[PDB]
Structure formats: C-alpha cells, structure tokens
Amino acid sequence: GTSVKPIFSRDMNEAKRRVRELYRAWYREVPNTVHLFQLDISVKQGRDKVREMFMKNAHVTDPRVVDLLVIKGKMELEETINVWKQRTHIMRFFHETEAPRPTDFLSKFYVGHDP
Amino acid sequence: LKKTTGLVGLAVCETPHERLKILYTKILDVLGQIPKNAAYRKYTEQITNEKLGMVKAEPDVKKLEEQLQGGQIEEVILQAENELSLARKMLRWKPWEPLVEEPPANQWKWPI
Amino acid sequence: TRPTIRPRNDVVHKQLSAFGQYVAEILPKYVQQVQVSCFNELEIFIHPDGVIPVLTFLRDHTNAQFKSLADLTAVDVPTRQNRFEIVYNLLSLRFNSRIRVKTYTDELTPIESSVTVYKAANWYEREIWDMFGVFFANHPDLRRILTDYGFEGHPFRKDFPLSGYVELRYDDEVKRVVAEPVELAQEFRKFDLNSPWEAFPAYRQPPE
Amino acid sequence: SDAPPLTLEAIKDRVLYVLKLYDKIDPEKLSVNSHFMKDLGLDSLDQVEIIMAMEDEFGFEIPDIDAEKLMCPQEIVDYIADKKDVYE
Amino acid sequence: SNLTLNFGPQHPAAHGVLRLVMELSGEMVRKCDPHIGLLHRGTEKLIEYKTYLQALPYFDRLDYVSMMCNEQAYSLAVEKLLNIQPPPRAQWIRVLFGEITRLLNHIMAVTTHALDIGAMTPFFWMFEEREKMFEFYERVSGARMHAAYIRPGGVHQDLPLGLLDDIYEFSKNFSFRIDELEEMLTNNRIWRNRTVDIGVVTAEDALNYGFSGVMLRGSGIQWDLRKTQPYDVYDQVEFDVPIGSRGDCYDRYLCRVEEMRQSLRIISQCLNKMPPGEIKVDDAKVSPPKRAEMKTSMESLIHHFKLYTEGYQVPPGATYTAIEAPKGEFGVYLVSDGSSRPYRCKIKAPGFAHLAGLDKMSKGHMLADVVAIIGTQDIVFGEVDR
Ligand SMILES: CCCCCCCCCCCC(=O)SCCNC(=O)CCNC(=O)[C@H](O)C(C)(C)COP(=O)(O)O
Ligand SMILES: COC1=C(OC)C(=O)C(CC=C(C)C)=C(C)C1=O
C-alpha cells in the first residue's frame, strides 16, 4: 500500500486531466502575452515554447509530482496574466544570450575538463 | 452604566449576568454529549461550573470582574462564546481517541 | 556559579510542565510528545493531522487563550524521512505565556493551512512555500512572496547552493536584463571549523 | 433573418477545413474516418489543440470530458450535431 | 473593470522598495496587493554559513532604523542558548542605548509619516537630533548606525570618559523639540482630518492578524513586552505605556510621541543609575580577553585565537527570544546543533505581519488615506524581506 495521501488527484488519469486543462489555459494565453509584453517572437514560437516545457516533465509517473507541477504551472500562468512578470522574465525561457554548447565528446574534450 | 470598555470593536454589554448564564448553560449542554471519561469534558465542565457559580453569587459587575479574574466582563462573554464554539468543534473532532500514527523512529531526535 | 551563570526559574518550569501534561491529556489523538527546555520553553510535538484541532484548542480554550501567532517557520533536516519541521510559536496575553507546536512533513505531503485559525498565517505559509517547497492545502492565495518572478527551486533547503544557479546582468544586444549560469570571480571559501574534541558531555550520543 | 439552418454536410465541411488547416496533418491522407492517434500519428496535446480549434470555429466550449473521447472527424461532427440538435 | 496601478518601488511614499499593486475605482481603493522581496537578500542562509559572532552584523542591517535593538535581541537569544549572564553594567548600557535607539526610530517614523502626508519641516527639525544620536553611536562604537556594539557577551567596549555628560546634555533639551513637533502637528485641523478615523482596526482583528507594539496599543490592548516579559534591567526602571482608544492613525501617532517622552524618562533613570564594573562576561571561553592579557598570558592568547578563528560552541537546542523593538515584537527562533555555527535562524519582524494586514486596513479609503496607512504601520523592508 505504501500508505501515501493525495494532493488533488487519485491516480494518473485525473492528473492528466489537470495537465490538459493547464495546457489549454497556457495555449489560450500565449497570443495575449505576445500582444501585451510587445514581444518580437511569433505566437507559434510561444506555443512551441509552451509545448517544450510540458514535454520536459512528460516522463514523470507519480501523481503527486504531477499535481505539484500543475500547481507550479498555474502559479506561473497567474504571474504572466497579471503582468507581474516583466519582458525579461518571459524572455528568460528562450536563453537568447547563452552561447550554444556542443554535446559531442570531441567538442567537450577541446574546450575543457567538464564531462 | 459603564461606557467605552476601552477595546476597539468591543461594545458595552447591558445585562451581562443573563448573557453569561445563557452561554454557560449552552456550554454545559454541548459538553453533555461528549463521553464521560474524556478529559476535555471534565476539565471544561469544572471550570465552567466554577465560573457559573461565581456569576450566580455576585450581582455587582465590578466585583464580578474582580472575582472572575477574566479582564473586563465583556471579554469574559467573548471567551465564553469562543469556548462554546470550541466545544462544538471538539465534539465534531473527537480528539479523545487514541493516538494515530506514531512518528518515525528518529523523527524528533536532536541534534541530528 | 553566581556571577557569570544564567539563573534558572523553577516555578515557571513546574507550571509549564503541568500545562504540557494538561494539553497532552486533553488531546491524546494528536499529541506525540511534550517537552520543557531548561530555559523554560514549552514545546508540543504532534501528528500533522492535528494541526487544525490543536491550534484551535490553544486559540479558543478558556485555560489556554493563545490568541496571537508570533511566528511560523520551517526547518530542513535532510537525514530525516520527513524532511521538513513545521514550527508554530504562540503567545497568550491572558496568561502571559508562550508555547511552541511542532509537526513534520516531506516534499510530497500537504499540510493543512491554518489561516482559518490565525489570519497572520497567510503570509507565513506563503514564505514556507517559497523557501522550502511545502504545499499548504486550502490556502486562499498561495504563491511566491520573497523570490524573483519565475525563480526555480527553494533556496532555504540544505541542498540548495548558497549562490544559486543563475545570475543577472544587463545585455545591450537584446537591451534588457538577462539570466545566465553563475560564474564567480572569487569562489566562496569553505571553512572547516569544528574541533575534533567533544565540547558538551551532557549531549553525548550512544555509540550505536 | 438569422443564420441559415445548419446541416450535417456543412458541419463536416467546416470540420475537415479546420483539420487541414492544422499544419501537422497532410491534407490528402486525412479522411472523415481517420484516427488521430493511429492513422495520423498525433499525441494527446495535438488532440487538445484540435479540440481548441473546433471550439474557436464553432463558437462553443467543449469540456475536458466529452472532448477527450473525440478521436476522429466523424465523432466531432456527431458531437456538434448533438449539441446543436441538428438532424439534417 | 478597475484601474490597476503600480505604487512603487520607485515612489517617494513607498518607504523603499515596495510594489503595491492597487485596484482602484476612481481614487477609491478596491484592493491592495503588496509585492515584496525587492530587498530579499537571503540573510538566513548566509547566517547558516557563519559563526555566531560573524552573524551579528546582519542584525544591524535587518531593521536599519533600530540597530542596537536587533543586536540586543540576537545577543539575548545566544545568551539563553549559552546559559550565561551579562554583567550589570553591560545590561544598563544595553537598556540606555535601546531607549536612544527607540528615540531614533520614533523620530524617523513620525517625521517621514508627516512628510508623506505633506508636512516637510518637522523632518528637518528632528534629523539634527538624529545626527547627535548618531554621534553618540559613533563615539561608543566608531560607526554612526551599524555599531555591532551589543554582543552575546555584553558589549564590545566600555563607554568613553565623557559620554554620559553629553547624553545628559542632549536629553535635558530633547523635550522642547518634541514640544515643537507637537505644536506643529497635534492640534492642526488638517493633520487631524488626514489622520483621525483612518485605518481603524479592532482589538480582536489586531490580535488575530499577528500585530504587535503600537499597532495593538492604539486599539486599547494593554500589552508591552518591557512590562510583562522584561529582559535586561527593564524591571528596574519606571515608565508608562501609552494606550489609544480609537485604533486609528491619529491615536498611534499620539502613542508614538508619548513613547518618545517615556523613553526620555527611562534614559534619565539609566543615566543616574549606571553601575561600575566590567562590560562583558568574565568567561574567556565566550567573551574575548583584553588585549593586554592576550599579549601576556598563554591561556588568554589561546582563547583569543580560538574565539576569533573557530568561535565558541553553543549547546544544542532551540529558543524563541522576543523583545519590544521600537516597531513591535522582534523575535529570533535560533536552533543550535552543538557547533560554532547556527543550524537555523528564523527572524520574526513585526513589519511582516503589519504589512500583511494592509489590505484589511485600507477598506473604504482613498489613495492618500492608503499613503497615510502605509506611514502609520512603521515599515522598513530590510526586516520585512530579510
Ligand atoms: C512564453 C513561454 C511561457 C512558458 C511557460 C511554461 C509553463 C510550464 C508548465 C509545465 C507544467 C508541467 O510540467 S505538467 C507535467 C507534465 N508531465 C506529466 O504530467 C507526466 C505524464 N506525461 C504524459 O502524459 C505525456 O508525456 C504528455 C506529453 C504529458 C501528454 O500525455 P498524453 O498525450 O498521453 O495524454
Ligand atoms: C523635503 O525634500 C525631501 C523630499 O521631498 C519631499 C523627500 O522625498 C526626501 C526623502 C524622504 C522621503 C520619506 C521619501 C527627503 C530626504 C527630502 O529632503
């Protein structure tokens, strides 16, 4: 049994339903974010970025972890809708000033010691 | 007779002896539904009975405030209402049942 | 023994012990332990499920009347299966006393919000959520309070690094403030200070 | 007068037009019976996006349930017909 | 919809770094949402990375209007965990400088409150007195505000030979400055119009919202930590606790002025009753030895070395220690694991709970009323954000 208590969801089905509701809300919100913050990206770029964030935590199989992730996503959406975030906060998702780092062994061997 | 109890939001109560009697009777009625061996019932019944007895034995408000040692009889009425609400909540909670879920082996060990 | 040593008060110690026994007797369902420190501070260790009842009792009981919540914070002890220790400090103005209530939780277990008992809890729980990641159920409005917008992690956890993972600067190409991985010109220097000789024999632990 | 009486054929045409406006579906492989999960190779989030596009086009909201089980154009057409009480 | 406005952080009336998001209907305030953390520096984790002596200067910068009071609270907590006792002269010095610090804080609060409401002159009149008290601070410690003077052994150094005379000279004249400020503000009909019946809070709501200090006393609650739970020598001085009856801004302003007068009274008593003796505990495993002994005797040099490199160990245990700071109850929850570095140090700031109650206090008021209510809560964001 392992005797654990829930946050919101009983199993993975309800957790997936909450995930889908959060995704719908973010997808609806993206064009308003592009308009209000005067972003130079397109709506497609924003929705692709939204999709990318969800995919990152796709592997998780625990309903409590999924519930907490949905709570955090709702908090982030609330920050975005009320314009508590600024333009810099929204653009931090895109890492525009970070130089790309190669994943190949040779590139890493050449630059430094880090694995 | 008295005005301006001195605490913002606490109005002056007229006829406080009757109000205290009603509140203590209601508290006793609510406590009557708790099991006899429960500690909350007997402790609260004891203290409420002392307060009711000293209420029924003093018609002067200033001396009653001095005897109750409860700080300005309007606050005594407020505390009686709070106790009645707590008694209802405890009847709902039933916290006299045995302990549930003893803690892990070293949950409360300090240092480390 | 006289001039440099703090004097102890035994009347307050006896009174606090008696009240701890009183509270433990009234609420056997939730009270796991009661302690009185030797500088006369009373603590009550409870099961998490009794956060709301116990507090309510302490707030509304005629003999307790702890109507002020002085502080509410968390402590992180990674070696415990339940990582986080939740601490309530309560003050009774009627009896001029203080009491401490303690419980525990882990990363995935919610604790019931105590805003219905004390209004002051509203921000404190938010801080606990921001700094430690402990979720409070039925909180009217739970979100970050201290950290920057979009900040990731809970900095008051023991495994969170002191300087964090990201740092901010102004970039002229994008004409805005940007975040990057932390790089320090001088690394913070860790000091190993503990003496290899035991200081306090009264706290020695059994050799297992 | 108000809008003309909507028929099943118009609903089917609008649904198919929306579906081929989705950049992740090839127009020629799409049919009224094609399955999003199997024939078209779309995941759950693509289905959510399709349902949102249908919501936008037909001007009414479909809950999470009653939409989580629409897996091909025919089911969407039937659901719209049932909600709009259209028989022709 | 209501109009949404950013009040601060770059605002004269924001008292530093505060993002008040207000929802307004016209100039009526429908909702206040304080956003803080613009001065969150992560003090508690940093303290976790220091020895007990190294962490003391952080308390100077928590509430940078009342420095020695925070030093006193932290020192009292460490003393309780150490089971040691400061010497009497150190305690008398602590109470004297705590009352001087209360004078400084109350001057700042009242004058900047009046400045926000629209009276600029009393600020200028009273900041000269603030500068003289800064001179007292510097003569005792070498720094004008961040003294680091009060330490868990007592005080760092003894008074210079002429300090008490100058403190007496300042104290015998400060009451006339208080009188001039009162003549400017107390009976002015514009001041009363801007303060009376503004931000009323009931006693029960004040208790349940976690208020402390004047924010209780203005509503009639008869509470004061110096009278009910005295700490150093506060049981040996005589003073009165001012109590309000309306629970509004005006009553709290009157309470703060009267508290300044009572502070002058206590300072007089402390000046007359200063005893002789040492100024830190005569225990070299806690308090560092004198320089002459450190350069003469082996044990003194060893203890100096160890106290300045590793620091003293504190027996394991947790305490909650509170004082009546000028802004309300100031507390420390300090946990020791037995080593020379604290395991956990939670700081309780009265401004935290006071600002958390801003939305309740602003119901049915206007923008300028909210500015006055911000001033009446006596908020410094160094302690609110920590
Ligand atoms: C402008 C930029 C703004 C950026 C905002 C970023 C907001 C991020 C919020 C992220 C919230 C979460 O992590 S929510 C956590 C998401 N991951 C899970 O729930 C675990 C189970 N994974 C799955 O089911 C599939 O991989 C899945 C792909 C989900 C689809 O599922 P189906 O199809 O089988 O239905
Ligand atoms: C009278 O001129 C002055 C101001 O303008 C009203 C200020 O705001 C300030 C800053 C202090 C307030 C609280 C913003 C100072 C110091 C000042 O001298």
PDB file of C-alpha atoms in Angstrom, chain E residues 171-333:
ATOM      1  CA  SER E 171      18.357  64.555  26.979  1.00  0.00           C
ATOM      2  CA  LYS E 172      17.737  67.693  29.038  1.00  0.00           C
ATOM      3  CA  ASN E 173      16.788  69.531  25.815  1.00  0.00           C
ATOM      4  CA  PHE E 174      15.078  66.914  23.606  1.00  0.00           C
ATOM      5  CA  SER E 175      11.679  67.517  25.254  1.00  0.00           C
ATOM      6  CA  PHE E 176      11.438  71.022  23.767  1.00  0.00           C
ATOM      7  CA  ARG E 177      11.988  69.563  20.287  1.00  0.00           C
ATOM      8  CA  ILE E 178       9.182  67.097  20.985  1.00  0.00           C
ATOM      9  CA  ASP E 179       7.045  70.057  22.074  1.00  0.00           C
ATOM     10  CA  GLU E 180       7.763  71.952  18.842  1.00  0.00           C
ATOM     11  CA  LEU E 181       6.837  68.928  16.722  1.00  0.00           C
ATOM     12  CA  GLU E 182       3.637  68.530  18.757  1.00  0.00           C
ATOM     13  CA  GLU E 183       2.815  72.215  18.266  1.00  0.00           C
ATOM     14  CA  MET E 184       3.216  71.678  14.527  1.00  0.00           C
ATOM     15  CA  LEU E 185       1.072  68.546  14.275  1.00  0.00           C
ATOM     16  CA  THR E 186      -1.115  67.527  17.217  1.00  0.00           C
ATOM     17  CA  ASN E 187      -3.826  70.213  17.149  1.00  0.00           C
ATOM     18  CA  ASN E 188      -3.661  71.059  13.429  1.00  0.00           C
ATOM     19  CA  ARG E 189      -7.076  70.530  11.843  1.00  0.00           C
ATOM     20  CA  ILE E 190      -5.539  69.433   8.527  1.00  0.00           C
ATOM     21  CA  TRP E 191      -3.416  66.816  10.308  1.00  0.00           C
ATOM     22  CA  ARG E 192      -6.457  65.576  12.242  1.00  0.00           C
ATOM     23  CA  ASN E 193      -8.507  65.480   9.031  1.00  0.00           C
ATOM     24  CA  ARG E 194      -5.786  63.385   7.399  1.00  0.00           C
ATOM     25  CA  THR E 195      -5.308  61.073  10.407  1.00  0.00           C
ATOM     26  CA  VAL E 196      -8.475  60.747  12.524  1.00  0.00           C
ATOM     27  CA  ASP E 197     -10.602  57.657  11.761  1.00  0.00           C
ATOM     28  CA  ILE E 198      -8.154  56.471   9.078  1.00  0.00           C
ATOM     29  CA  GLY E 199      -7.084  52.833   9.142  1.00  0.00           C
ATOM     30  CA  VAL E 200      -9.227  51.765  12.103  1.00  0.00           C
ATOM     31  CA  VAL E 201      -8.525  48.232  13.350  1.00  0.00           C
ATOM     32  CA  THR E 202     -10.344  46.421  16.152  1.00  0.00           C
ATOM     33  CA  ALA E 203      -8.557  44.763  19.062  1.00  0.00           C
ATOM     34  CA  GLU E 204      -9.679  41.252  18.088  1.00  0.00           C
ATOM     35  CA  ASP E 205      -8.604  41.714  14.467  1.00  0.00           C
ATOM     36  CA  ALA E 206      -5.272  43.155  15.610  1.00  0.00           C
ATOM     37  CA  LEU E 207      -4.693  40.112  17.820  1.00  0.00           C
ATOM     38  CA  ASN E 208      -5.683  37.573  15.157  1.00  0.00           C
ATOM     39  CA  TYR E 209      -3.664  39.280  12.408  1.00  0.00           C
ATOM     40  CA  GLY E 210      -0.452  38.992  14.436  1.00  0.00           C
ATOM     41  CA  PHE E 211       0.005  42.694  15.175  1.00  0.00           C
ATOM     42  CA  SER E 212       2.301  43.908  17.942  1.00  0.00           C
ATOM     43  CA  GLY E 213       3.533  47.055  19.630  1.00  0.00           C
ATOM     44  CA  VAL E 214       1.723  50.303  18.869  1.00  0.00           C
ATOM     45  CA  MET E 215      -0.493  48.506  16.339  1.00  0.00           C
ATOM     46  CA  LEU E 216      -2.028  46.777  19.361  1.00  0.00           C
ATOM     47  CA  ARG E 217      -1.809  49.651  21.838  1.00  0.00           C
ATOM     48  CA  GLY E 218      -3.682  52.067  19.583  1.00  0.00           C
ATOM     49  CA  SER E 219      -6.708  49.758  19.781  1.00  0.00           C
ATOM     50  CA  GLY E 220      -6.689  49.635  23.593  1.00  0.00           C
ATOM     51  CA  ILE E 221      -4.759  46.398  24.150  1.00  0.00           C
ATOM     52  CA  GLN E 222      -2.693  46.750  27.333  1.00  0.00           C
ATOM     53  CA  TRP E 223       0.440  44.907  26.244  1.00  0.00           C
ATOM     54  CA  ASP E 224       4.138  45.782  26.374  1.00  0.00           C
ATOM     55  CA  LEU E 225       6.999  43.287  26.413  1.00  0.00           C
ATOM     56  CA  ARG E 226       9.146  45.533  28.624  1.00  0.00           C
ATOM     57  CA  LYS E 227       6.471  45.383  31.349  1.00  0.00           C
ATOM     58  CA  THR E 228       5.129  41.829  31.012  1.00  0.00           C
ATOM     59  CA  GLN E 229       8.331  39.996  29.959  1.00  0.00           C
ATOM     60  CA  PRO E 230      11.304  42.215  30.896  1.00  0.00           C
ATOM     61  CA  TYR E 231      14.715  41.125  29.676  1.00  0.00           C
ATOM     62  CA  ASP E 232      17.776  43.060  30.813  1.00  0.00           C
ATOM     63  CA  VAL E 233      17.085  45.549  33.628  1.00  0.00           C
ATOM     64  CA  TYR E 234      13.692  46.779  32.440  1.00  0.00           C
ATOM     65  CA  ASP E 235      12.181  45.675  35.759  1.00  0.00           C
ATOM     66  CA  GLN E 236      14.300  48.355  37.493  1.00  0.00           C
ATOM     67  CA  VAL E 237      13.008  51.390  35.558  1.00  0.00           C
ATOM     68  CA  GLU E 238       9.738  53.308  35.816  1.00  0.00           C
ATOM     69  CA  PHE E 239       7.693  54.391  32.799  1.00  0.00           C
ATOM     70  CA  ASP E 240       4.129  54.434  31.495  1.00  0.00           C
ATOM     71  CA  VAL E 241       2.697  52.620  28.477  1.00  0.00           C
ATOM     72  CA  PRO E 242       0.592  54.911  26.237  1.00  0.00           C
ATOM     73  CA  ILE E 243      -2.766  53.440  25.220  1.00  0.00           C
ATOM     74  CA  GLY E 244      -5.111  54.582  22.461  1.00  0.00           C
ATOM     75  CA  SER E 245      -8.893  54.330  22.271  1.00  0.00           C
ATOM     76  CA  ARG E 246      -9.824  54.801  18.585  1.00  0.00           C
ATOM     77  CA  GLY E 247      -7.463  52.405  16.801  1.00  0.00           C
ATOM     78  CA  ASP E 248      -6.774  54.913  14.009  1.00  0.00           C
ATOM     79  CA  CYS E 249      -3.695  56.693  12.666  1.00  0.00           C
ATOM     80  CA  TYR E 250      -4.041  59.710  14.970  1.00  0.00           C
ATOM     81  CA  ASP E 251      -4.074  57.626  18.159  1.00  0.00           C
ATOM     82  CA  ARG E 252      -0.981  55.704  17.047  1.00  0.00           C
ATOM     83  CA  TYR E 253       0.807  58.993  16.317  1.00  0.00           C
ATOM     84  CA  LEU E 254      -0.064  60.242  19.814  1.00  0.00           C
ATOM     85  CA  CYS E 255       1.150  56.930  21.254  1.00  0.00           C
ATOM     86  CA  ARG E 256       4.496  57.255  19.461  1.00  0.00           C
ATOM     87  CA  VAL E 257       5.019  60.821  20.727  1.00  0.00           C
ATOM     88  CA  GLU E 258       4.192  59.739  24.281  1.00  0.00           C
ATOM     89  CA  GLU E 259       6.567  56.781  23.907  1.00  0.00           C
ATOM     90  CA  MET E 260       9.328  59.234  22.982  1.00  0.00           C
ATOM     91  CA  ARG E 261       8.621  61.121  26.213  1.00  0.00           C
ATOM     92  CA  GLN E 262       8.689  57.857  28.195  1.00  0.00           C
ATOM     93  CA  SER E 263      11.993  56.984  26.509  1.00  0.00           C
ATOM     94  CA  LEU E 264      13.436  60.280  27.749  1.00  0.00           C
ATOM     95  CA  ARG E 265      12.229  59.331  31.240  1.00  0.00           C
ATOM     96  CA  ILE E 266      13.902  55.903  31.060  1.00  0.00           C
ATOM     97  CA  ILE E 267      17.107  57.446  29.687  1.00  0.00           C
ATOM     98  CA  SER E 268      17.225  59.796  32.676  1.00  0.00           C
ATOM     99  CA  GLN E 269      16.852  56.840  35.043  1.00  0.00           C
ATOM    100  CA  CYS E 270      19.565  54.861  33.222  1.00  0.00           C
ATOM    101  CA  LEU E 271      21.951  57.829  33.329  1.00  0.00           C
ATOM    102  CA  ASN E 272      21.505  58.216  37.081  1.00  0.00           C
ATOM    103  CA  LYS E 273      21.879  54.508  37.944  1.00  0.00           C
ATOM    104  CA  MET E 274      24.805  53.364  35.782  1.00  0.00           C
ATOM    105  CA  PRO E 275      26.890  51.000  37.957  1.00  0.00           C
ATOM    106  CA  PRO E 276      30.634  50.269  37.808  1.00  0.00           C
ATOM    107  CA  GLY E 277      32.302  47.040  36.701  1.00  0.00           C
ATOM    108  CA  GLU E 278      33.225  45.005  33.655  1.00  0.00           C
ATOM    109  CA  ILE E 279      31.264  45.266  30.413  1.00  0.00           C
ATOM    110  CA  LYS E 280      31.372  41.645  29.194  1.00  0.00           C
ATOM    111  CA  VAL E 281      31.058  38.286  30.917  1.00  0.00           C
ATOM    112  CA  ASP E 282      34.228  37.205  32.730  1.00  0.00           C
ATOM    113  CA  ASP E 283      34.392  33.899  30.854  1.00  0.00           C
ATOM    114  CA  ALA E 284      37.110  33.728  28.203  1.00  0.00           C
ATOM    115  CA  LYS E 285      35.543  30.699  26.511  1.00  0.00           C
ATOM    116  CA  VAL E 286      32.723  33.067  25.465  1.00  0.00           C
ATOM    117  CA  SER E 287      33.966  36.681  25.623  1.00  0.00           C
ATOM    118  CA  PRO E 288      37.415  37.558  24.249  1.00  0.00           C
ATOM    119  CA  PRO E 289      40.058  38.583  26.794  1.00  0.00           C
ATOM    120  CA  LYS E 290      41.543  42.053  26.982  1.00  0.00           C
ATOM    121  CA  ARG E 291      44.384  42.870  24.597  1.00  0.00           C
ATOM    122  CA  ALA E 292      46.919  43.295  27.411  1.00  0.00           C
ATOM    123  CA  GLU E 293      46.129  39.834  28.793  1.00  0.00           C
ATOM    124  CA  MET E 294      46.144  38.306  25.299  1.00  0.00           C
ATOM    125  CA  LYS E 295      49.720  39.557  24.797  1.00  0.00           C
ATOM    126  CA  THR E 296      50.858  38.425  28.273  1.00  0.00           C
ATOM    127  CA  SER E 297      49.360  35.050  29.253  1.00  0.00           C
ATOM    128  CA  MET E 298      49.223  31.748  27.382  1.00  0.00           C
ATOM    129  CA  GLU E 299      45.577  30.897  28.126  1.00  0.00           C
ATOM    130  CA  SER E 300      44.410  34.348  27.033  1.00  0.00           C
ATOM    131  CA  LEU E 301      46.213  34.042  23.693  1.00  0.00           C
ATOM    132  CA  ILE E 302      44.820  30.538  23.124  1.00  0.00           C
ATOM    133  CA  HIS E 303      41.261  31.648  23.862  1.00  0.00           C
ATOM    134  CA  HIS E 304      41.611  34.768  21.697  1.00  0.00           C
ATOM    135  CA  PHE E 305      42.891  32.630  18.805  1.00  0.00           C
ATOM    136  CA  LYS E 306      40.087  30.086  19.145  1.00  0.00           C
ATOM    137  CA  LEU E 307      37.307  32.645  19.622  1.00  0.00           C
ATOM    138  CA  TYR E 308      38.369  34.586  16.543  1.00  0.00           C
ATOM    139  CA  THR E 309      39.001  31.558  14.290  1.00  0.00           C
ATOM    140  CA  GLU E 310      36.520  28.824  15.231  1.00  0.00           C
ATOM    141  CA  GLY E 311      34.257  30.698  17.643  1.00  0.00           C
ATOM    142  CA  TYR E 312      32.536  29.436  20.752  1.00  0.00           C
ATOM    143  CA  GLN E 313      30.370  26.333  20.594  1.00  0.00           C
ATOM    144  CA  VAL E 314      26.723  26.606  21.643  1.00  0.00           C
ATOM    145  CA  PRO E 315      24.983  23.627  23.278  1.00  0.00           C
ATOM    146  CA  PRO E 316      22.284  22.131  21.047  1.00  0.00           C
ATOM    147  CA  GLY E 317      18.743  23.389  21.439  1.00  0.00           C
ATOM    148  CA  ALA E 318      16.188  25.811  20.088  1.00  0.00           C
ATOM    149  CA  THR E 319      14.920  29.094  21.508  1.00  0.00           C
ATOM    150  CA  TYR E 320      12.387  31.744  20.561  1.00  0.00           C
ATOM    151  CA  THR E 321      13.537  35.051  22.054  1.00  0.00           C
ATOM    152  CA  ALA E 322      11.499  38.232  21.609  1.00  0.00           C
ATOM    153  CA  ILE E 323      11.970  41.883  22.563  1.00  0.00           C
ATOM    154  CA  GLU E 324       9.846  45.035  22.412  1.00  0.00           C
ATOM    155  CA  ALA E 325      11.630  46.640  19.486  1.00  0.00           C
ATOM    156  CA  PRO E 326      10.524  50.170  18.506  1.00  0.00           C
ATOM    157  CA  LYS E 327       8.399  48.732  15.670  1.00  0.00           C
ATOM    158  CA  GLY E 328       6.786  45.953  17.724  1.00  0.00           C
ATOM    159  CA  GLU E 329       7.755  42.437  18.785  1.00  0.00           C
ATOM    160  CA  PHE E 330      11.098  41.434  17.251  1.00  0.00           C
ATOM    161  CA  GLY E 331      11.939  37.761  17.597  1.00  0.00           C
ATOM    162  CA  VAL E 332      14.546  35.147  16.773  1.00  0.00           C
ATOM    163  CA  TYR E 333      13.969  31.398  16.513  1.00  0.00           C
TER     164      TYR E 333
END
